[PDB]
Structure 1
Amino acid sequence: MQMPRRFNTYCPHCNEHQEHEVEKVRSGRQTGMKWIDRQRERNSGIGNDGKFSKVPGGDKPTKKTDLKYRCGECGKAHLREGWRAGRLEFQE
Structure 2
Amino acid sequence: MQMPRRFNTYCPHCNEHQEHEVEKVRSGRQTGMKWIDRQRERNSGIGNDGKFSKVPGGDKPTKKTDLKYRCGECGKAHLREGWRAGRLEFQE
Shorter-chain TM band: over 0.9
Distance 1:81 1:75 in 2: 20
How far is 1:13 from its partner?
0.2
Query: Cα RMSD (Å) of the superposition?
Result: 0.2
How far is 1:91 from its partner?
0.1
Partner of 2:48: 48
How far is 1:15 from its partner?
0.1
How far is 1:33 from its partner?
0.1
How far is 1:56 from its partner?
0.3
Query: TM-score, normalising length from structure 2?
Result: 1.00
**Number of aligned positions between the proteins:** 92
Q: Deviations over 1:36-87 (max 9, x none)?
A: 0000000000000000000000000000000000000000000000000000
Q: Deviations over 1:5-51 (max 9, x none)?
A: 00000000000000000000000000000000000000000000000
Q: Percent identity?
A: 100
Alignment gaps of 5+ in structure 1: none
Distance 2:43 2:71 in 1: 44
Alignment gaps of 5+ in structure 2: none
